Amino acid sequence: APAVDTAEQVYISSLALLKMLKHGRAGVPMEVMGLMLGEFVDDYTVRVIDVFAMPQSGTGVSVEAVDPVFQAKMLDMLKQTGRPEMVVGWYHSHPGFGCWLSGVDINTQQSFEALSERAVAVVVDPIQSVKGKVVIDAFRLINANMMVLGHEPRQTTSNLGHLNKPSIQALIHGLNRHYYSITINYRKNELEQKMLLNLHKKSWMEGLTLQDYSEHCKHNESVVKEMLELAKNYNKAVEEEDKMTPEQDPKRHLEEHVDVLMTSNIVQCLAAMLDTVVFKLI
Amino acid sequence: DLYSRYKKLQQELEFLEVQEEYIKDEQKNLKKEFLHAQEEVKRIQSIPLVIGQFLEAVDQNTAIVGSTTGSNYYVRILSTIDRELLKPNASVALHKHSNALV
Amino acid sequence: RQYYLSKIEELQLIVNDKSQNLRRLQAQRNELNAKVRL
Amino acid sequence: RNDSYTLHKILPNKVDPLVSLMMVEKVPDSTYEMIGGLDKQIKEIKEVIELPVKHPEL
């Protein structure tokens, strides 16, 4: 009997992740659900090209929460649009509950896997996804007959599936007992990286735009006053150092202050000279 | 003898030059990574945070705090926190989702 | 003969200086890497 | 632990903050040399505060 390898990866595209995050935040504090479109490239790869949200239902997040008619018309209209990808799986948001599958989640995942054996149930935490870390895991299932007899849920052929460690919160809620966490990887080509770089790419202007001069003098005065106080502290510390065998430091904070003063002053001076030169009447 | 020693000498010099270049590049990358890590550590101090009372320090980096939510947690003290300000019953700010003494 | 020994001593001196420089740079990188790891 | 509730560390004994504050961590600056009179009072208080603790053998 074939067994899914532990090296299988869920290749979630960048815009799919963005849409999942935005929809999950939008539904807070409720739970949202949407269907994931993509293609199962092979046994060891699941590619999630795109994901579309679904209307909020009073049931919550269940298999009655996915309605047939909206799903059908959405799929047909996207196929007409240019995205003829089969539904790979479903996603729902556990707001602040961590990433795991509840009993209703497991029931919905069994319903989805009835359609196709390969079907992930990736969930996302919209509020725990604070800037930096993104809390999103993907679980498929564990067949009951598979676990009861004795075999491991997944065959292992490499260290790819063991790079990340499971969480206690997921483990208690049935991880490695009813479902396994599939390693998640983000498909991000150079084009989308460059496009997303425009979010914080300031402009061609601020590289030449001088900061306010009076504000610059006020900032310099403040930092030099801090320099004076920190220099008094450093002198006192050094005077203690001689009466000290090897046994916050003013020196370090002084170093950070001198660094910020240096960069600010040098940047302002160089920018002033450049505006003097290039921004000329001639 | 002399020529073999001279060969080993410039070979060692070239190896040292390559190591110097590698160390310089790694130093630049490590400065970049240190800046990113410091930014992350500053970002964990963002808002909102739950207020708690610093009950008693256990280690250099861990402590017991009684969060105002009515519960006591054994949490991790941020390194950047100045230690001698961490006195018993002092009001401290805890991370919302981890209760870490932020 | 003497040219060989002159090259030997010059190369040994520059190698010693570069080795001390490399040790200093390795110490600096080690402390910065320790900071990053922490 | 997080919510698995696994005993993973032993912490020092529980003393609630409202009472742990009553420890005199910073000793006050008042000496017997700054007390006028009260010599007999000082000896009497020392016979109960100091003598028992210092030498209980007596």
Side-chain angles (χ1 to χ4, degrees), chain B residues 2-3 5-6 9-10 12-13 16-17 19-20 22-24 26-27 30-31 33-34 37, chain C residues 1 3-5 7-8 11-12 14-15 18-19 21-22 25-26 28-29 32-33 35-36:
Chain B
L2 258 292
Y3 174 70
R5 242 180 322 277
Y6 167 86
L9 259 280
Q10 48 273 346
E12 184 54 293
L13 179 152
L16 288 212
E17 176 269 347
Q19 281 195 66
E20 241 202 314
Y22 140 77
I23 281 290
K24 290 273 214 53
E26 170 147 89
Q27 272 269 13
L30 277 198
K31 252 173 193 183
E33 271 298 321
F34 178 69
Chain C
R1 165 49 208 61
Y3 142 87
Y4 264 107
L5 203 67
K7 300 301 111 181
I8 284 324
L11 279 181
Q12 198 267 0
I14 174 155
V15 153
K18 244 168 173 60
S19 148
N21 204 286
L22 189 289
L25 253 54
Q26 279 195 345
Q28 286 192 24
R29 181 259 180 207
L32 186 58
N33 183 60
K35 261 145 53 175
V36 159

Side-chain angles (χ1 to χ4, degrees), chain A:
Chain A
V4 286
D5 193 313
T6 203
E8 197 203 27
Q9 302 205 352
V10 174
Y11 286 117
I12 278 144
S13 92
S14 31
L15 94 154
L17 167 65
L18 263 307
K19 289 221 257 198
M20 272 165 75
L21 272 195
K22 174 210 72 87
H23 185 207
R25 151 42 38 61
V28 171
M30 281 336 317
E31 287 192 51
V32 312
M33 165 192 315
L35 293 206
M36 275 186 351
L37 318 165
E39 59 164 357
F40 301 86
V41 175
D42 50 48
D43 164 331
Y44 306 75
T45 282
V46 167
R47 185 162 301 187
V48 182
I49 174 50
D50 168 48
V51 60
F52 71 90
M54 271 195 68
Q56 167 78 34
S57 301
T59 291
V61 277
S62 163
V63 85
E64 30 265 54
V66 47
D67 91 7
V69 53
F70 183 94
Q71 182 247 11
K73 57 171 90 77
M74 186 43 117
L75 258 176
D76 188 11
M77 158 166 154
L78 255 299
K79 185 194 295 328
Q80 198 281 323
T81 302
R83 183 52 48 71
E85 260 73 359
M86 61 162 329
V87 55
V88 154
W90 69 293
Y91 87 100
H92 78 298
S93 52
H94 284 334
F97 308 165
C99 306
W100 41 273
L101 291 208
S102 57
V104 46
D105 296 335
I106 301 200
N107 202 90
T108 62
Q109 179 57 18
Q110 292 157 288
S111 70
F112 267 101
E113 278 175 35
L115 269 274
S116 42
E117 300 304 308
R118 312 264 307 297
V120 307
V122 45
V123 333
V124 72
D125 202 293
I127 53 197
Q128 290 188 7
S129 312
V130 157
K131 190 108 92 203
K133 91 174 295 170
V134 176
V135 202
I136 163 168
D137 308 17
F139 333 93
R140 177 166 290 112
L141 250 200
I142 304 171
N143 166 239
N145 127 88
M146 180 31 102
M147 191 53 44
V148 297
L149 191 146
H151 334 108
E152 287 153 49
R154 287 188 297 170
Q155 78 172 318
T156 298
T157 44
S158 42
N159 307 11
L160 304 191
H162 307 245
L163 288 201
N164 51 66
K165 316 306 234 273
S167 66
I168 275 159
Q169 198 180 2
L171 255 169
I172 168 64
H173 288 153
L175 186 58
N176 283 326
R177 179 130 31 77
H178 306 130
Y179 46 88
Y180 49 71
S181 179
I182 319 196
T183 87
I184 198 178
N185 188 15
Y186 305 131
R187 277 193 65 290
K188 32 190 215 195
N189 55 30
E190 54 93 9
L191 194 152
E192 307 210 350
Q193 295 245 343
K194 304 309 291 276
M195 155 82 179
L196 283 174
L197 227 43
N198 299 80
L199 175 58
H200 289 346
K201 173 201 316 305
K202 341 189 173 193
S203 169
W204 68 273
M205 291 109 96
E206 322 96 342
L208 315 164
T209 317
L210 301 209
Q211 89 172 244
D212 190 340
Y213 231 74
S214 298
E215 198 290 321
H216 185 287
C217 328
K218 138 171 73 183
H219 180 77
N220 269 26
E221 189 85 39
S222 59
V223 196
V224 75
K225 290 323 214 319
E226 307 327 281
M227 209 139 277
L228 186 279
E229 283 318 309
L230 260 66
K232 302 280 273 303
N233 267 357
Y234 180 64
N235 168 81
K236 173 57 62 38
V238 154
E239 195 142 295
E240 192 281 335
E241 271 213 353
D242 55 77
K243 171 47 211 79
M244 184 81 131
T245 50
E247 284 168 0
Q248 74 311 319
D249 36 2
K251 154 177 136 45
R252 187 217 326 161
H253 293 214
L254 198 57
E255 235 200 326
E256 284 97 44
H257 279 188
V258 86
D259 176 356
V260 64
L261 211 181
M262 278 309 192
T263 175
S264 166
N265 215 62
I266 291 312
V267 157
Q268 180 82 342
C269 269
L270 260 279
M273 314 249 282
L274 302 185
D275 301 48
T276 282
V277 164
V278 60
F279 263 80
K280 174 60 188 149
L281 184 45
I282 310 300

